[PDB]
Design a protein around this ligand. Structure first.
Ligand SMILES: CCCCCCCCCCCCCCCCCC(=O)OC[C@H](CO[C@@H]1O[C@H](CO[C@H]2O[C@H](CO)[C@H](O)[C@H](O)[C@H]2O)[C@H](O)[C@H](O)[C@H]1O)OC(=O)CCCCCCCCCCCCCCCCC
Ligand code: CLA
Ligand code: CLA
Ligand code: CLA
Ligand SMILES: C=Cc1c(C)c2cc3nc(c4c5[nH]c(cc6nc(cc1[nH]2)C(C)=C6CC)c(C)c5C(=O)[C@@H]4C(=O)OC)[C@@H](CCC(=O)OC/C=C(\C)CCC[C@H](C)CCC[C@H](C)CCCC(C)C)[C@@H]3C
Ligand SMILES: CCCCCCCCCCCCCCCCCC(=O)OC[C@H](CO[C@@H]1O[C@H](CO)[C@H](O)[C@H](O)[C@H]1O)OC(=O)CCCCCCCCCCCCCCCCC
Ligand SMILES: CCCCCCCCCCCCCCCCCC(=O)OC[C@H](CO[C@@H]1O[C@H](CO)[C@H](O)[C@H](O)[C@H]1O)OC(=O)CCCCCCCCCCCCCCCCC
Ligand SMILES: CCCCCCCCCCCCCCCC(=O)OC[C@H](CO[C@@H]1O[C@H](CS(=O)(=O)O)[C@@H](O)[C@H](O)[C@H]1O)OC(=O)CCCCCCCCCCCCCCC
Ligand SMILES: CC1=C(/C=C/C(C)=C/C=C/C(C)=C/C=C/C=C(C)/C=C/C=C(C)/C=C/C2=C(C)CCCC2(C)C)C(C)(C)CCC1
Ligand SMILES: CC1=C(/C=C/C(C)=C/C=C/C(C)=C/C=C/C=C(C)/C=C/C=C(C)/C=C/C2=C(C)CCCC2(C)C)C(C)(C)CCC1
Ligand SMILES: CCCCCCCCCCCCO[C@@H]1O[C@H](CO)[C@@H](O[C@H]2O[C@H](CO)[C@@H](O)[C@H](O)[C@H]2O)[C@H](O)[C@H]1O
Ligand code: OEC
Ligand SMILES: [Cl-]
Ligand SMILES: [Fe+2]
Lengths: 35, 37, 32, 82, 65, 28, 51, 50, 37, 34, 32, 340, 51, 34, 335, 51, 35, 34, 37
C-alpha cells in the first residue's frame, strides 16, 4: 500500500519516545555525580 | 481593586482559553481536510 | 450475651452451608 | 485488522529509519546527559546540589512555614549559603 | 382515562410532548451561559480556597460581627 | 580497570555463532 | 547460611510445582485426554446426575 | 419475573403511581423530620447554653 | 377500577435466597463486634 | 531491510547495558551510602 | 460519593437503553 | 456543518482511537504521567518535607517520589501563577506544585478515560459495564488523594506519589487510624483478595476443562476466534466443583457478572472507610475492651497488643514525618519495651 | 403534613389513570418533561426569591 | 461485659429484617403456579 | 460380593458421590474434621495461652473476653519452640491449653488436609477425563498457608512465631513482620500485591467485558441471566464484539481475541504473583529481608539526607521497640 | 439566583429543546431526568459537606 | 494419656494404610478411556 | 428508666417473627397463578 | 427421586393476614409493659 509518514500514531509514539530517551540520557549521567 | 492575585487569575483564565483555542483551532482545521464518504 | 450472638450467626452460616450444598436447585441441562 | 498507519515492523526494519534514528536517538541522549552534567537541571528545578542542603554549621531544615510569603521565605533560605 | 376539574385546567401545560425546536436551536446561546457559569464557579471556588484574594473579602470567621 | 572489554566480545559471540549461520544459511 | 537456605527453598518449592505439573500431565497423557475433552464422548455426560 | 432490585421499574411510565410513590417518600421524610424533632425535645437539656 | 396494566410479577430463585442470606449473615458477623463495641 | 531478530537482540543488550549502568550507580552515585 | 455511582449507572442505562438486555449480529470492527 | 466534520474526524477508527473524550483524556493523562516522571528524576522535596526525592539527588526507583506540598500551603490548589509560586516555575517546584499538578490533572484524566469507555462502547454498540466497573478505581483515587486530605489539615497528609512514599501512607494509617481494624477496609481486602481468587480459579477451571479442537498439545492455536460452540465444557466444570467444593456455577452470565461485582464492591467499601478517616472518624478502639484493660492488668488480647504497636509507630515516626510541628521527644518520653 | 401527603399518596395510587398523563396525540401515557422542568424551575426561583 | 446495650437488637434486626425480606420473596416465587 | 475391598475402592473412587471423597480424601476428610472441630471449640472456650513463654497468658477466645474481630487461637508457647506438643505430651489438658497445645493440633491437621485437598483437586479431574493443573493454581494459596504456618516458624525457630488464628492476631503477625523484615521493601511482596491487585483488576476486566457483550435473548423486564441455559452448545457472548471494544480502548494488538490465551493469562497472573509472595515469607523466614536504604543519600559534608525510606524506618522502629514488651533481655533481637 | 431562576424558568416554559439535544440527552425519557438530577444532588451534597 | 497416644497412632495407621493400599490397587486404570 | 435490658428485643422479636411468618404466606398465596 | 405425592399448597388470605397482624400487634402492646417490667 502507499502508507503515509506523519500520522496521529506517530505523534503519540513520539510524545513518549522523545522525552523518555532524553530522561534515560539524563539519569545515565547522574550515575557519576558524587561528593 | 485588581489585586496581584486577581491579575494572576486573568493570566490563568487567559492562558487557559488560548490552549482551548489553539486546540480546537488545529482540530476544526485538520478535521476539514479529509472524511470522504 | 455477645458470645451467644456470635456463635448463633456462625451456627446460622453453617446451617446455610448445608442447605446450599445438599438442597440446591438441581442443575438441569439443555431443556431448562 | 488494519488501519492507515504503516506497519511498525516495516519501519523498524527500513534502512531509512535507522539512517534517521542513528542520528536522532543518540542526539536526544547526549542532550539529556548535558542537561544534568552542565548543572542546568539543578537550576531548572531548584534542586540542591550535594553541597547545598544545609549551611556549613546549621543542621536545621529550611521548612517553608507560610503559604503566601513562601516564595519570599524560600529565597531567604538560599541566602544563608544553603 | 379519567378527566377531572383540575385535570382539564392543567391539560394544556402537559400536551406539547415530543415538540422540539429544529436543528441546533438555542444550543449556541446555551453554551455561553454554561461557560460563564463554569468561570463563575471557578471564581467563588478560588476565593474560598484563598487562591484569589480580593481586598474587601476576608475569607475567615472574621469580617463578621 | 575496564574488563568490560571482555564481556563485550563474549557477549556478541553468542548472536554471532547464529548470525554466521543466517549468512551460510542452514540448520537453524 | 541465609543465601543458601533461601535460594534452595525457592528452587525446592518450584520443583514441587514442577512435579505436580509434569505428574498431572503424565496421567492425562497416558489415559489420553491431556489435549481436551472429547467433544463427542464427553465422560461427564455418561454419568448419572448427582444434583 | 422481575428481579428484586427492579420492582420499582413498575413506575417508569405510570405518572400517576410515580406521583403516588414520591408522595409517600416525601411523607416519610416529612414524618421523620417531625418525629426526630420530638425525640430531641424529649432529651435536650436547655439548662445551660454556655 | 381498572386493573392497572403496568404490573409484573416478582421473583427470587433459591440460589439467590442462599446468596442473599450468606451476605446478610456474614455482614452481621462482621459488624456485630462494632455494634456491641 | 534489517532482520528483526537482530533489531531486538541489539536493542535488547542495549537495555541490559543502560539498566545495568543504573545498578552500578547504586554502589557509587549519591544513592550510595558512602 | 455513593450517589456518583447512581449517576454513572442511571446515565449509562439511558444512553444505552437500546443495547440493554444484550446485543446482536454483524462483524464490522477494524475497517472504517 | 463543521461540528459533524469535527466529529467525523475524531471518531475515525485509527490505531489509537481519539474521540471527543480524547480532547480531555490525552492532555491530562500525558501531563499527569509526565509530571511524575519529571519530579521523579529532577524535583526535590527538601523545602517541603526535608527529604531527597529524585534520581538527581540519589534516590532509586523505590525511594523516589513527588512529595506533597508543605503543611503551610493548606488545601491550596497551588497554581503555577497563584499567590504562592507567583508565576515562577522553579519556586512552584520547590513548593510541591507538581503534586497538585499530577493530582488534579490525573483526576480529570480518569474522568476522560471513563468517558472514553462510555463513548467507545456506544460506537461499537456494546453495553457499558466496563464503565460501571471503572467507577471503583475512581472512588478510590477521589477518596484517598482528594477527599481524605481535604478533611485533614492540608495536602501534606495525602499520599505522596511514589513507591516508598506510599508505604509510609500504609504504616501511618495503621499507627494513627488503626485502619486494619476497620470493617470497611476488611470488606475492601475481602473484595480484592476474593477478586484475585475468582480471576485465578476461573482461568484455571477453563484451561483444564477445554474440549479438544486440535491435534497439538499446545491447545492455544485450537481456538475459534469466530464463536460457535463453547470452547470449554461448562457442564464438566459444574460437576467438578460440585464434587470438590460442594458448590459450583452453572450460568456463565452470572459467573461473569459476579466477577465484576466482587472486586468493584470491595473497592467501594474500602473508599467509604477512608472517607470516614478524613474526619478521623476511625474504627480505632473497642470500648468494652479498654474498660476491662484499665481495671484489670492481666487481661490481654491480640487487640491490646496491636494498640501498643501503634503507640510506638506514632511516637517514633511523628518527629520526622510531621516537620511543621517541630516535635521534640526526649529519649525518656519515648515508649519502649525491655532491652529493645 | 406527613399525614396529609400520605392520604394524597393513596388517592393518587387508586386514581392512577388520570387523563392528564395520557398524550392527546398518541393516546398513551406521556409526560412533556422539557415544559415541566420549566414550570418547576419557575416555582423554585419564585420561592427562592421570597426566602 | 461492658458492651453496648443496643448492640444486641442492632445485630438482631440487622439479620432478621433483610433475611425476612428475601424469604418472603423466595416463598412467593416458589409458590407461583406453572 | 465381587470382593469387599475391591468394592470399597470402587466406592471411594466413585464419581457418583455427591462429594468426591477421593483417595486423598480418605486422609483429608478426617484431618479437616479434627482441625475444624478443635478450632471452633478453642476459639469459643479455650483459656489464655502463654505464647511468648514468659508466663504472660494471652486470652483469645470469646468466652474469655474476646469478640470475633479480636478473638483468635493463640500459637504454642515459645518455651516449646519447634518441639512436637501432642496432647499425650502433657501432664494434663490444663497444661496443654496453657502452652498453646490446640494451635499445633490445628495447624498440622489443616496443612495436612489442605494438601490432600490439592491432591484431590487432581484426582477428580483425572476420574472425569479433564486436564489436571487446576490443583496447580490452588498450589499458590496453599504454599502461603504453609509459608505462614510452618516455613516461617521452622525458620524463626518456634511455632509461637507463626501467624495466629484470628483477625486481630493476623494484623499482629503483619505489623511485627514489617518491623523485623521490612517486607514492603521486598521484591517478592511487591510482586504479590501486583498479582492480587492485578487479579482483582483483571477479574473486573474480564467480568465486565464479557457480561457487557452478551447476545440479547432476554426481555426488557426479565433478568439478562435467563438468556443462558445450563448445557449450551454455542457461546453466550460476542467475544468478537468484546475484543472490538477493548481493542479500541487501548489499541488492537494490546487486546485478547483468543479466549484460551485470555483465560491462561487470567489464571497465570495471580497464581504466579501469589507464588512469589509465598516465596517472600518463606525467604524472609531465613532473615533475607527487604531492601535497606537507611542513610543512603548523604550530602557533601556527610550529613544524612532522609528519603521516604527513612521515614519508613522510624515507623518500623516503633513497632520493633514496642512489640513483645517484656520478652527481651538483651540488645539484639535475634529470634 | 431566585430572579435568574424565575427568568430561566419562563424561558423553558416557552422555548423548546433543540432537536439535536432532545436526541442527544434522550429527553422525553424520564430515566434521564434522574441521571441529571442525581448528578446535581450529589454535587450539592459534596458542597454542604465542605461548608 | 498413654492410651490416647496408642489410639491416635492406630487410627492414623488405618487411614495411612487405606491410602497406600489404595493408589496401589491399580489406580491408573480408574479413568474414562486408555487403561 | 430502670427497665429490663432485654425488654426491647423481647418486644421486637415478638412482633417481627410471627408477623413475618404471616406476610411470607400471604405474599406466597397472593402470587399463585390463576 | 419421585415427586412426593403427599404435598398440597399453602394459603393465607388477605383478611387472615390482617386478623393475624391485629392479634400480634395488640398482644405486643399488652406484654411489652411486662417485658420492660
Ligand atoms: C466525583 C468525580 C470526580 C470529580 C473530580 C473533580 C476534581 C476537581 C477538584 C477540585 C477540588 C477543589 C477543592 C478545594 C477546597 O475544597 O479547598 C478547601 C477550602 C477551605 O480551605 C481551608 O481553609 C481554612 C479553614 O480554616 C477556617 O477556620 C479558621 C481557623 O483556621 C480560619 O479563619 C479560616 O480562614 C477558615 O476558613 C484552612 O486554612 C484550611 O487549611 C484550608 O485552607 O474549602 C473550599 O474551598 C470550599 C469547599 C467546597 C466543597 C467541595 C469540597 C469537597 C468536600 C470535602 C469535605 C471534606 C470531607
Ligand atoms: C484540555 C485539557 C486540560 C485541562 C482540563 C486542564 C486543566 C487544568 N490545568 Mg492544565 N494544561 C493542559 C491541558 C489541560 N489542563 C495542557 C495541554 C497543558 C500544557 C500547555 C497544561 C498546563 C498546565 C499548567 C502549567 C497548569 C495547569 C493547571 C491546570 C488546572 C488549573 C488551571 C485553571 O485554573 O484553569 C482555568 C480555566 C479556564 C482558563 C477555562 C476558561 C474557559 C472559558 C469558557 C473561556 C472564557 C474566557 C474569557 C476571557 C473570560 C471572560 C470573563 C470576563 C469577566 C473576564 C486545571 C485542573 C495548573 C495547575 O495544575 O495548578 C495546580 C497549572 O499550573 N495546566
Ligand atoms: C435519586 C435517587 C434514586 C432513585 C429515585 C432511584 C431509582 C431507581 N433505581 Mg437507583 N440508585 C441510586 C439512586 C436512585 N435510584 C443510587 C445513589 C445508586 C448507587 C448506589 C443507585 C443504584 C441503582 C442500581 C444499581 C439499580 C438502580 C435501579 C433503580 C430503579 C429500580 C429501583 C428498584 O426497584 O430498587 C429495588 C429496591 C429494593 C427492593 C432494595 C433496596 C435495599 C436498600 C439498598 C437498603 C437500604 C434501604 C434504605 C431505606 C435506603 C435509605 C435511603 C437513603 C438514601 C437515605 C429505579 C428507577 C435498578 C434498575 O436500573 O433496574 C433495571 C438497578 O439495578 N439504582
Ligand atoms: C411547608 C413547607 C416546609 C417548610 C416551611 C419547611 C421548613 C423547615 N423544614 Mg422541612 N420539609 C418539608 C416542607 C417544609 N419544611 C417537606 C415536604 C419535607 C419532606 C420532603 C420536609 C423535610 C424536612 C426535613 C427532613 C427537615 C426539614 C427541616 C426543616 C427546617 C429547617 C429548614 C432548612 O434549613 O432547610 C434546608 C433547605 C435546603 C435543603 C436547601 C434546598 C436548596 C436545594 C439544594 C436547591 C435545589 C436545586 C434547585 C432546583 C435549583 C434551582 C434553583 C434556582 C433558583 C437557581 C424548617 C423549619 C429540618 C429540621 O430541622 O427538622 C425539623 C430537617 O431536618 N424538613
Ligand atoms: C494500584 C493498583 C492498580 C493500578 C496501577 C491500576 C491501573 C489501571 N487500571 C486500568 C483500568 C481498570 N481497572 C479496573 C479495576 C480495578 N483496578 C484495580 C487496581 C489498579 N488498576 C482494582 C483493585 C480493580 C477492581 C475494582 C477496571 C474496570 C479498569 C479499566 O477499564 C481500565 C483499563 O483499561 O484496564 C486495562 C487502566 C486505566 C489506564 C488509564 O486510565 O489511563 C488514562 C489516565 C491516565 C494515564 C492518568 C492517570 C493519573 C493518575 C490518577 C495519577 C498517577 C500518578 C503517576 C502518573 C503514577 C505514579 C504514582 C505511583 C508510583 C504511586 C490502568 C492500567
Ligand atoms: C515508550 C515507552 C516508555 C514509557 C515510559 C512509562 C514509564 C515506565 C516506568 C518508569 C520507571 C522509571 C525507573 C527509573 O527510571 O529508574 C532510574 C533509577 C536510577 O538509579 C539511581 O541512580 C543514581 C541517581 O543519582 C543513584 O545511584 C541511585 O541510587 C539510583 O541507583 O534506576 C534504578 O535504580 C532502578 C532500576 C530500574 C527499576 C525499574 C523497574 C520498574 C518496574 C515497574 C514498572 C511499572 C509498573
Ligand atoms: C469440602 C466442602 C467445603 C464446604 C464449602 C462450603 C461452601 C459455602 C457455600 C455457600 C453458599 C453458596 C451459595 O449460596 O451460592 C450458590 C451459587 C451456585 O448457584 C448459582 O445459581 C445460579 C445463579 O443465579 C447460576 O446458575 C450460578 O452459575 C450458580 O449455579 O454459587 C454462586 O453462584 C456464587 C459463587 C460464590 C460462592 C460463595 C463462596 C463461599 C464463601 C463462604 C465464605 C463465608 C465463610 C463464613 C465463615 C463463618
Ligand atoms: C475415627 C474414624 C471416624 C469414622 C466415622 C464413621 C464413618 C463416617 C460416617 C459418616 C456419617 C455422616 C454422613 C455424611 C453424609 C454426607 O456427607 O453426604 C452423603 C453423600 C452421599 O454418599 C453416598 O451415600 C450413599 C447412601 S445414601 O445415598 O446416603 O442413602 C452410599 O451408598 C454411598 O456409598 C455414599 O457415597 O456423601 C458423599 O457424597 C461422599 C463424600 C462424603 C464427604 C464427607 C465429608 C467431607 C468433609 C470434608 C472436610 C470438611 C471440614 C469441615 C467443614 C464443615
Ligand atoms: C512537568 C510539567 C510539564 C510536563 C512535562 C512533560 C510532559 C514531561 C514528560 C516526561 C516523560 C514522558 C518522561 C519519561 C521518562 C521515562 C523514563 C525515564 C523511563 C525509564 C524506563 C526504564 C528504566 C525501563 C525499565 C524496565 C522496565 C520498567 C520493565 C522491565 C524491563 C526494563 C528494565 C526495560 C509541563 C512542561 C507541561 C508544564 C510544567 C509541568
Ligand atoms: C395519617 C394522619 C395523621 C397522622 C400522621 C402521623 C402520625 C404520621 C407519623 C409519621 C411518622 C412517625 C413517620 C416516621 C418516619 C421515620 C422514618 C422514615 C425513618 C427512617 C430512618 C432511616 C431510613 C434510618 C436509616 C439508618 C439506619 C437504620 C442506621 C444506619 C444509618 C441510617 C441513617 C441509614 C394526622 C393525625 C396528622 C391527620 C391526618 C391523617
Ligand atoms: C486548560 C487550561 C490550561 C492552562 C495552561 C497554562 C500554562 C501556562 O501558564 C502560564 O505560565 C507562564 C510561565 O510559562 C506564567 O508566567 C509567569 O512567569 C513569567 C516568566 O516565566 C512571568 O513573566 C509572568 O509574569 C508570570 O505570570 C503564567 O502566569 C501562567 O499562566
Ligand atoms: Mn514473637 Ca519474631 Mn519479635 Mn523477636 Mn519474637
Ligand atoms: Cl506484640
Ligand atoms: Fe471467562
Amino acid at each position: 500500500v502507499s502508507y503515509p509518514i506523519f500520522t496521529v500514531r506517530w505523534v503519540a509514539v513520539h510524545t513518549l519516545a522523545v522525552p523518555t530517551i532524553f530522561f534515560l540520557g539524563a539519569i545515565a549521567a547522574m550515575q557519576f555525580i558524587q561528593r | 481593586t485588581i489585586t496581584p492575585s486577581l491579575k494572576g487569575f486573568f493570566i490563568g483564565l487567559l492562558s487557559g482559553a488560548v490552549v482551548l483555542g489553539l486546540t480546537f483551532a488545529v482540530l476544526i482545521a485538520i478535521s476539514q481536510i479529509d472524511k470522504v464518504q | 450475651m455477645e458470645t451467644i450472638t456470635y456463635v448463633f450467626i456462625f451456627a446460622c452460616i453453617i446451617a446455610l452451608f448445608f442447605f446450599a450444598i445438599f438442597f440446591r436447585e438441581p442443575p438441569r441441562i439443555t431443556k431448562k | 485488522g488494519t488501519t492507515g498507519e504503516r506497519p511498525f515492523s516495516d519501519i523498524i526494519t527500513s534502512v531509512r529509519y535507522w539512517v534517521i534514528h542513528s542520528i536522532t536517538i543518540p542526539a536526544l541522549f547526549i542532550a539529556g546527559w548535558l542537561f544534568v552534567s552542565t548543572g542546568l537541571a539543578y537550576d531548572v528545578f531548584g534542586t540542591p546540589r550535594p553541597d547545598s542542603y544545609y549551611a556549613q554549621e546549621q543542621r536545621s531544615i529550611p521548612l517553608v512555614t507560610d503559604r503566601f510569603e513562601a516564595k519570599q521565605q524560600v529565597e531567604t533560605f538560599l541566602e544563608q549559603l544553603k | 382515562a379519567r378527566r377531572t376539574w383540575l385535570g382539564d385546567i392543567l391539560r394544556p401545560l402537559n400536551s406539547e410532548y415530543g415538540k422540539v425546536a429544529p436543528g441546533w436551536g438555542t444550543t449556541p446561546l446555551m453554551a455561553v451561559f454554561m461557560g460563564l457559569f463554569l468561570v463563575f464557579l471557578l471564581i467563588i471556588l478560588e476565593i474560598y480556597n484563598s487562591t484569589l484574594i480580593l481586598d474587601g473579602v476576608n475569607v475567615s470567621w472574621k469580617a463578621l460581627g | 580497570i575496564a574488563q568490560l572489554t571482555m564481556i563485550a566480545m563474549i557477549g556478541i559471540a553468542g548472536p554471532m555463532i547464529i548470525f554466521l549461520l543466517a549468512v551460510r544459511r542452514g540448520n537453524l | 547460611r541465609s543465601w543458601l537456605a533461601t535460594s534452595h527453598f525457592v528452587l525446592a518449592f518450584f520443583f514441587l510445582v514442577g512435579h505436580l505439573w509434569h505428574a498431572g500431565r503424565a496421567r492425562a497423557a497416558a489415559a489420553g485426554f491431556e489435549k481436551g475433552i472429547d467433544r463427542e464422548s464427553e465422560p461427564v455426560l455418561s454419568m448419572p446426575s448427582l444434583d | 419475573g422481575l428481579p428484586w432490585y427492579r420492582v420499582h421499574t413498575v413506575l417508569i411510565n405510570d405518572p400517576g403511581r410515580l406521583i403516588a410513590a414520591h408522595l409517600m417518600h416525601t411523607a416519610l421524610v416529612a414524618g421523620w423530620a417531625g418525629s426526630m424533632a420530638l425525640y430531641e425535645l424529649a432529651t435536650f437539656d436547655p439548662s445551660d447554653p454556655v | 377500577m381498572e386493573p392497572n396494566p403496568n404490573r409484573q410479577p416478582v421473583e427470587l430463585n433459591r440460589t439467590s435466597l442462599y446468596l442473599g442470606l450468606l451476605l446478610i449473615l456474614v455482614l452481621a458477623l462482621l459488624f456485630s463486634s462494632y455494634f456491641f463495641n | 531491510r534489517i532482520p528483526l531478530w537482530i533489531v531486538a537482540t541489539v536493542a535488547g543488550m542495549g537495555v541490559i547495558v543502560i539498566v545495568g549502568l543504573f545498578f552500578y550507580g547504586a554502589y557509587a552515585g549519591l544513592g550510595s551510602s558512602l | 460519593l455513593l450517589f456518583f455511582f447512581g449517576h454513572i449507572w442511571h446515565g449509562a442505562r439511558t444512553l444505552f437503553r437500546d443495547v440493554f438486555s444484550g446485543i446482536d449480529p454483524e462483524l464490522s470492527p477494524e475497517q472504517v | 456543518g463543521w461540528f459533524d466534520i469535527l466529529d467525523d474526524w475524531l471518531k475515525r477508527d485509527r490505531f489509537v482511537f481519539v474521540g471527543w473524550s480524547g480532547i480531555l483524556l490525552f492532555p491530562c493523562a500525558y501531563l499527569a504521567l509526565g509530571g511524575w516522571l519529571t519530579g521523579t528524576t529532577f524535583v526535590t522535596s527538601w523545602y517541603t518535607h526535608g527529604l531527597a526525592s529524585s534520581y538527581l539527588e540519589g534516590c532509586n526507583f523505590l525511594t523516589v517520589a513527588v512529595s506533597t506540598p508543605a503543611n503551610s500551603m493548606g488545601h491550596s490548589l497551588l497554581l503555577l501563577w497563584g499567590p504562592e509560586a507567583q508565576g515562577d516555575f522553579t519556586r512552584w517546584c520547590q513548593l510541591g506544585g507538581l503534586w497538585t499538578f499530577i493530582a488534579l490533572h490525573g483526576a480529570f484524566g480518569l474522568i476522560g478515560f471513563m468517558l472514553r469507555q462510555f463513548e467507545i462502547a456506544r460506537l461499537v454498540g456494546v453495553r457499558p459495564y466496563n464503565a460501571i466497573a471503572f467507577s471503583a478505581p475512581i472512588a478510590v483515587f477521589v477518596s484517598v488523594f482528594l477527599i481524605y486530605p481535604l478533611g485533614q489539615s492540608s495536602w501534606f497528609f495525602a499520599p505522596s506519589f511514589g513507591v516508598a512514599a506510599i508505604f509510609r501512607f500504609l504504616l501511618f494509617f495503621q499507627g494513627f487510624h488503626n485502619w486494619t481494624l476497620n470493617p470497611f477496609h476488611m470488606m475492601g481486602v475481602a473484595g480484592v483478595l476474593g477478586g484475585a481468587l475468582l480471576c485465578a480459579i476461573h482461568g484455571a477451571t477453563v484451561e483444564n476443562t477445554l474440549f479438544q479442537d486440535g491435534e497439538g498439545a499446545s491447545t492455544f492455536r485450537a481456538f475459534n476466534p469466530t464463536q460457535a460452540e463453547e470452547t470449554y465444557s461448562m457442564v464438566t466444570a459444574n460437576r467438578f466443583w460440585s464434587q470438590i467444593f460442594g458448590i459450583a456455577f452453572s450460568n456463565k452470565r452470572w459467573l461473569h457478572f459476579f466477577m465484576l461485582f466482587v472486586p468493584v464492591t470491595g473497592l467501594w467499601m474500602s473508599a467509604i472507610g477512608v472517607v470516614g478517616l478524613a474526619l478521623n472518624l476511625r474504627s480505632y478502639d473497642f470500648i468494652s475492651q479498654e474498660i476491662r484493660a484499665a481495671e484489670d492488668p492481666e487481661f490481654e488480647t491480640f487487640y491490646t497488643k496491636n494498640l501498643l504497636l501503634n503507640e510506638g509507630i506514632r511516637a517514633w515516626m511523628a518527629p520526622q514525618d510531621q516537620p511543621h510541628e517541630n516535635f521534640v521527644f526526649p529519649e525518656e518520653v519515648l515508649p519502649r519495651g525491655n532491652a529493645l | 403534613l406527613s399525614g396529609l401527603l400520605f392520604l394524597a399518596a393513596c388517592w393518587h395510587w387508586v386514581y392512577w389513570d388520570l387523563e392528564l398523563f395520557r398524550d392527546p396525540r398518541t393516546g398513551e401515557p406521556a409526560l412533556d418533561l422539557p415544559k415541566m422542568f420549566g414550570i418547576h424551575l419557575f416555582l423554585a426561583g419564585l420561592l427562592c426569591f421570597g426566602f | 461485659m461492658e458492651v453496648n446495650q443496643l448492640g444486641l437488637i442492632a445485630t438482631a434486626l440487622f439479620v432478621l429484617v433483610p433475611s425476612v425480606f428475601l424469604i418472603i420473596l423466595y416463598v412467593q416465587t416458589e409458590s407461583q403456579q406453572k | 460380593s465381587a470382593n469387599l475391598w475391591e468394592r470399597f475402592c470402587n466406592w471411594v473412587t466413585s464419581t457418583d458421590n455427591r462429594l468426591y471423597v477421593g483417595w486423598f480424601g480418605v486422609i483429608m476428610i478426617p484431618t479437616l474434621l479434627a482441625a475444624t472441630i478443635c478450632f471452633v471449640i478453642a476459639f469459643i472456650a479455650a483459656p489464655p495461652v502463654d505464647i511468648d513463654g514468659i508466663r504472660e497468658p494471652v486470652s483469645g477466645s470469646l468466652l474469655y473476653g474476646n469478640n470475633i474481630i479480636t478473638g483468635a487461637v493463640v500459637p504454642s508457647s515459645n518455651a516449646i519452640g519447634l518441639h512436637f506438643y501432642p496432647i499425650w505430651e502433657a501432664a494434663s489438658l490444663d497444661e496443654w491449653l496453657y502452652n498453646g497445645g490446640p494451635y499445633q493440633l490445628i495447624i498440622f491437621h489443616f496443612l495436612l488436609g489442605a494438601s490432600c485437598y490439592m491432591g484431590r483437586q487432581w484426582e477428580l479431574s483425572y476420574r472425569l477425563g479433564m486436564r489436571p493443573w487446576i490443583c496447580v493454581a490452588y498450589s499458590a494459596p496453599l504454599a502461603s498457608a504453609f509459608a505462614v504456618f510452618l516455613i516461617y516458624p521452622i525458620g524463626q525457630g518456634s511455632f509461637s512465631d507463626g501467624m495466629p488464628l484470628g483477625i486481630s492476631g493476623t494484623f499482629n503477625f503483619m505489623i511485627v513482620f514489617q518491623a523485623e523484615h521490612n517486607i514492603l521493601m521486598h521484591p517478592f511482596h511487591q510482586l504479590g500485591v501486583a498479582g492480587v491487585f492485578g487479579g482483582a483488576l483483571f477479574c473486573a476486566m474480564h467480568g465486565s467485558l464479557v457480561t457487557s457483550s452478551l447476545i440479547r435473548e432476554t426481555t426488557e423486564t426479565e433478568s439478562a441471566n435467563y438468556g443462558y441455559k445450563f448445557g449450551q452448545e454455542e457461546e453466550t457472548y460476542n467475544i468478537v464484539a468484546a475484543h472490538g471494544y477493548f481493542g479500541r480502548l487501548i489499541f488492537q494488538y494490546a487486546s485478547f481475541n483468543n479466549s484460551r490465551s485470555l483465560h491462561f493469562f487470567l489464571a497465570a497472573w495471580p497464581v504466579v504473583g501469589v507464588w512469589f509472595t509465598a516465596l517472600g515469607i518463606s525467604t524472609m523466614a531465613f532473615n533475607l529481608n527487604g531492601f535497606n536504604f537507611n542513610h543512603s543519600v548523604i550530602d557533601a559534608k556527610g550529613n544524612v539526607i532522609n528519603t521516604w525510606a527513612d521515614i519508613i524506618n522510624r515507623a518500623n522502629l516503633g513497632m520493633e521497640v514496642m512489640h513483645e514488651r517484656n520478652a527481651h533481655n538483651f540488645p539484639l533481637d535475634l529470634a | 439566583a431566585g430572579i435568574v431562576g424565575i427568568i430561566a424558568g419562563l424561558f423553558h416554559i416557552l422555548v423548546r429543546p433543540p432537536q439535536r439535544l432532545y436526541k442527544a440527552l434522550r429527553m422525553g425519557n424520564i430515566e434521564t431526568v434522574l441521571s441529571s438530577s442525581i448528578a446535581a444532588v450529589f454535587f450539592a451534597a459534596f458542597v454542604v459537606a465542605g461548608t | 494419656m498413654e492410651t490416647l497416644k496408642i489410639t491416635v497412632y492406630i487410627v492414623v495407621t488405618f487411614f495411612v494404610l487405606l491410602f497406600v493400599f489404595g493408589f496401589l490397587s491399580g489406580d491408573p486404570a480408574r479413568n474414562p478411556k486408555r487403561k
